[PDB]
Amino acid sequence: VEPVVVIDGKGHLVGRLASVVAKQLLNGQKIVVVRAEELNISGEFFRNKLKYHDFLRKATAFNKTRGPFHFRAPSRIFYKALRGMVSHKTARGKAALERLKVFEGIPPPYDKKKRVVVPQALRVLRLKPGRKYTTLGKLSTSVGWKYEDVVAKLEAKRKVSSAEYYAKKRAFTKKVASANATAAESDVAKQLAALGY
Amino acid sequence: MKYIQTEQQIEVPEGVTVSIKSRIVKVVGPRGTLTKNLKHIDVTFTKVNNQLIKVAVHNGGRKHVAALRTVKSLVDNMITGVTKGYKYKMRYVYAHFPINVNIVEKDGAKFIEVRNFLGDKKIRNVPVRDGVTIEFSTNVKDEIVLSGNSVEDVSQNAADLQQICRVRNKDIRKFLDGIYVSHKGFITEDL
Amino acid sequence: MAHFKEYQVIGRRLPTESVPEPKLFRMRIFASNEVIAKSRYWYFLQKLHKVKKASGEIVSINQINEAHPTKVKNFGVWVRYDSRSGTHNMYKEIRDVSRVAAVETLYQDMAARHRARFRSIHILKVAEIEKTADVKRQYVKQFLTKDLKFPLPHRVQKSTKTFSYKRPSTFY
Amino acid sequence: TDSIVKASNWRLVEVGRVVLIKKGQSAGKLAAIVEIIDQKKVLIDGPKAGVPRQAINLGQVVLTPLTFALPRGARTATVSKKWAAAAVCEKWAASSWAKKIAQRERRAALTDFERFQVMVLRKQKRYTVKKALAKA
RNA sequence: UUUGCUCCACACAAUAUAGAUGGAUACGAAUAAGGCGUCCUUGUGGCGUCGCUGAACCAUAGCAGGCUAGCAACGGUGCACUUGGCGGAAAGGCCUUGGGUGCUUGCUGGCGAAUUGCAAUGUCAUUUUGCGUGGGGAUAAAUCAUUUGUAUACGACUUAGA
RNA sequence: GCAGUCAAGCGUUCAUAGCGACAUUGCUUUUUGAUUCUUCGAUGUCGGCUCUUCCUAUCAUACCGAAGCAGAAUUCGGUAA
RNA sequence: AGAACUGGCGAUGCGGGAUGAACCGAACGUAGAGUUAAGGUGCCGGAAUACACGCUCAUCAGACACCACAAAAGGUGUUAGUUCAUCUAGACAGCCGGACGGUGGCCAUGGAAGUCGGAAUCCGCUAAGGAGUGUGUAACAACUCACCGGCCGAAUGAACUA
RNA sequence: GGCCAGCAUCAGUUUUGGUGGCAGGAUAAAUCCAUAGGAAUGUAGCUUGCCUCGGUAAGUAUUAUAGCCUGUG
Ligand SMILES: [K+]
Ligand SMILES: [Mg+2]
Ligand SMILES: [Mg+2]
Ligand SMILES: [Mg+2]
Ligand SMILES: [Mg+2]
Ligand SMILES: [Mg+2]
Ligand SMILES: [Mg+2]
Ligand SMILES: [Mg+2]
Ligand SMILES: [Mg+2]
Ligand SMILES: [Mg+2]
Ligand SMILES: [Mg+2]
Ligand SMILES: [Mg+2]
Ligand SMILES: [Mg+2]
Secondary structure (H helix, E strand, C coil): CCCEEEEECCCCCHHHHHHHHHHHHHCCCEEEEECHHHCEEECCHHHHHHHHHHHHCCCCCCCCCCCCCCCCCHHHHHHHHHHCCCCCCCHHHHHHHHCEEECCCCCCCCCCCCCEECHHHCHHHHCCCCCCEEEHHHHHHHCCCCCHHHHHHHHHHHHHHHHHHHHHHHHHHHHHHHHHHCCCCCHHHHHHHHCCC | CCEEEEEEEEECCCCCEEEECCCEEEEEECCEEEEEECCCCCCEEEECCCCEEEEEEEEECHHHHHHHHHHHHHHHHHHHHHHCCEEEEEEEECCCCCCEEEEECCCCCCEEEEECHHHCCCCEEEECCCCCEEEECCCCCCEEEEEECCHHHHHHHHHHHHHCCCCCCCCCCCCCCEEEEEEEECCCCCC | CCCCEEEEEEECCCCCCCCCCCCCEEEEEEECCHHHHHHHHHHHHHHHCCCCCCCCCEEEEEEECCCCCCCCEEEEEEEEEECCCCEEEEEEEEEECCHHHHHHHHHHHHHHHHCCCHHHEEEEEEEECCCCCCCCCHHHHCCCCCCCCEECCCCCCCCCCCCECCCCCCCC | CCCEECCCCCCEECCCEEEEECCCCCCCCEEEEEEEEECCEEEEEECCCCEEEEEEEHHHEEEEEEECCCCCCCCHHHHHHHHHHHCHHHHHHHCHHHHHHHHHHHHHHCCHHHHHHHHHHHHHHHHHHHHHHHHC
16 A cells, blocks of 8 residues: 555564565565564574575585575575565566565665564464574574674664654654643534544 | 463562563572573463462463473572572592692683693683682582572583583593582571 | 264164064264265164165154253263274263264364374264263363363454554453 | 562453454354353353354454353353343443444444545644644 | 767756555564553552554645635645754665745635536656756866786786877 | 394393394395386497596594493494585 | 276377376367366465364474385374273372391202292281392392382372374 | 447346245254252352451352253143
8 A cells, every 4th residue: 555565574474474575566566674684484493594504505516606596694585585486587577576675674764664564474473372483683694694793783773763763753642642632522523523533 | 281271389488579570580589689581481470479479371281381380490499599599519529630629810700720630731611600609618628619599500500510520531430530519409508 | 074963863674574664773973964864874774783775764864953052061972983003992072062063073183183084983972971070081171160261362363454554462 | 579570461261251253143242251161162142232142262252351240151041131230231332442343333334425524624623733732 | 079078947859667646654672461641669660541453643625726805823734945953774864943935624705617518547747868048067088009027828917108 | 235123042140332043124226137118320338547526324533422441442323424 | 027897198189286198177160258177275376374173393394196105113202092000098209217037948059148040939027028129249248129117198100002 | 331439228148245935844953931850160148267458268058149950831
């Protein structure tokens, strides 16, 4: 319903999130995924690390620069999960993938935009309580991603700024809730309540 | 079998205050304060009468109800650590070479230094975890005492000291040299 | 097989000139429809007496409704089933409001826990346990304690929309 | 000096618990838990709203915060009597939850002319509220 | 440089559109817990309240939105200025001061619409490019050829030469 | 060719440190067979030399568990190519 | 490799089994509409991230016949059952006490005292104690266990089945 | 006369809804009503012991100051 939908990837069950995003892309909706380092995969961290090492051992024997490329960053792991489910060798799949952007953290363009979630992909809603899960940032660091610390520091700075912004917004929201708390016994307010507003 | 409800009781002695937010348990007693994160177990804590904390698992399986009693034991150990404390006594055992155990300082970190283990020239250094006090026992030959509020911390320090003195390339049934936990009790006696 | 109904099926072992009015055997059969009920009746009659569908007849098939479909009951169910390597008898206890619901639960549970298909299961007996403390299975006994209450932690509300704007909660 | 343990008070599956049916023939009516059959099944009874006495999966209902005194296994007449005595319908109607449901129903029932009137009245209220916010 | 280059404003031409048709509307964290409000002894505190989805909130009336007369109140909103601050992860955006100016549907009026003929997206957006008219700004290099050998099959590389 | 399961016995005593009969279950395609599906208008037919890579059923090296491991030496086994 | 009956492929496209002569479904003029078969409905990919009951966590999970493999034997992993037992006259586990006397029971043995072995499996006192469950000695000795007690107080144990 | 369409009333094929009247069953079973008999996951009452306000615990007690089950109609 929005020109661009920004999904906060934190705790979002990378495969199910990739399914949702792939369907949105192929249906023509522009999707930006932020905080890809905070995505989750079901299964133990050791399980998913072994899976990534099984992926890593696959390479073109006569020239390793031709074989499958093993991207280490969490955003690129998500992008691989999504490209494997988009028909990326066709022009339509290329357009669908061009409708997509994945980021670690929330870069400056999107740190001031609304972030949505996908409940059908949310880990807390999908995974049975007590089931173990992996964190994409930790897995990526274990398999060679170099920027977990930098992303963490920039996320802390962004969270500080966002907390200040939200304190200001909460104060203004309290002012507005006071303003509509009064003028609620006026005739206009009673008519609106009679009409459902 | 998916038991509907399983609960355990945690008795709280008088001088102990237990603050339980979502699953961050803080126990305060005469000897200090302990904190434990139990967010991996999915249990429910409820205060009954200020001397009793119930911990419950609803619709739990076999492993879940086992972890419930594990949680109860862990909180009981925190309370025991802040009321009685925990002390582990270890005796150095050696056939020929005397094991020299001392407290040394390196950048203010208070390592336990083990020299002459089985005649080795190598010097073993076991860091002392924060909160663990090391005392060398008089009137008992070759005895080290590790004390603290956290039973996990004191037991892990004793385990580290024991493991650093493992014999390699020899029949350990014959070469019994090492530093072995000889007693696990409390700091305060007969309480 | 499907949502079950219970039928009484009475069959005859068709009369001859020497033996008029044969012994009119009856069975309570759980089946999804009357064709299957009659088929199961003939299957068990061929397991029990020297008769077949060609040499007998169905005198009556009548659906038996639950006497008190809105009263919660504990049922004891004796079943016989074929595993991959043998035949075994089992006793299970099911809490439900009707025999048909208890039997559906029994078939689902046998399929889930023993991989026993419908064809491999014989319902020996379904009887209501009138008196508690004759309930002998803890997974039913735990539901008979006085003033039983339990919460439903970690509620998962189904979203009608692909995207949510609120980071929902599992409180209940 | 005293222990502090967060309560996290859930709504409990219990005899006399008031539930709201979300899907089925009822689909929005209130019922009362008559008895508990299994961890996932209860026997409910909604006689005031017209909900038949039935065994229902707990996934088909949502527990409300309302409870009233009802014996286990009470029949339809007893459930109706205790429901009327406890005035469950009024207690639910007073809740914000039922008020929100009624608001959604009213908004869905609005006509085009009523929506135009809603916009006009919203503009009037907005004028007054913005003036008050600027004065404050 | 057969008057070249760049930027801005306007006009006119082309050029296409992975696809606008009110608004991508910003805490963080947890989910066997939280949000908001309030109070105090400021905490892993008390009290109240909320969720059970955004079916929300904002916006939204006027020849695709005209021309005018007032009432009420110093509000809302757009425009071009302007004071200052913050933002470097891809900042290229956010906030803010003052005055000017247009609209205001917060309320009450007057005038206009028609014949696109009973519908025909009935053309309202942004992407680049060119050209002309004014204004602002600047006034180089690279390669070939020669040369070097820290290089070299040839290209290439590394050097030098007003 | 390699690996299991049982366990009568060997191992001075003691089944299982190391072995292990009578049986029995497998795995592998580096043996040799069986077959004749591809190739007879033609896939150059031994071995060695050279060079790269792969497997592990690991000889050595790393860290270990076990022993009929006192030391030394050795044997069995694990992670390991 | 060779026979019997039938159906097929050869001679056959089409939908499904990713892929494939034989399998499933269905056999074919050119089109429109509807309904289906076999197979499917997270995304690739048309179609429910449908509903319901359970089971499974795999440091080589598993995921639809033909078909692209796995066995014997095992596992207080977990689930569901069968049978037999113990238990408020006190069960299981746990800690503590006793664990005797005839008697070194009879026999080769060099020695053999419960514990290298052959047979004999008794009696007494018993709440209870094997002519001994193991460690140990050259033999003893000394420890230990069956068995009975003290403490606790409600369920527990074994062999099997899949 | 040609090209592309819109609407209405029909015809054939078909898809998706709203709603009405009947038939059968154990002339559904239920619910409900009336009656009889019961025990318990034992309601009121009563007895006993404790204790922080005031109830619990243990017995008895089959409807009472809640109800439930079964049969019959
Ligand atoms: K040839
Ligand atoms: Mg690299
Ligand atoms: Mg050695
Ligand atoms: Mg050739
Ligand atoms: Mg060749
Ligand atoms: Mg190996
Ligand atoms: Mg031919
Ligand atoms: Mg064919
Ligand atoms: Mg296949
Ligand atoms: Mg689709
Ligand atoms: Mg097996
Ligand atoms: Mg001896
Ligand atoms: Mg028609």
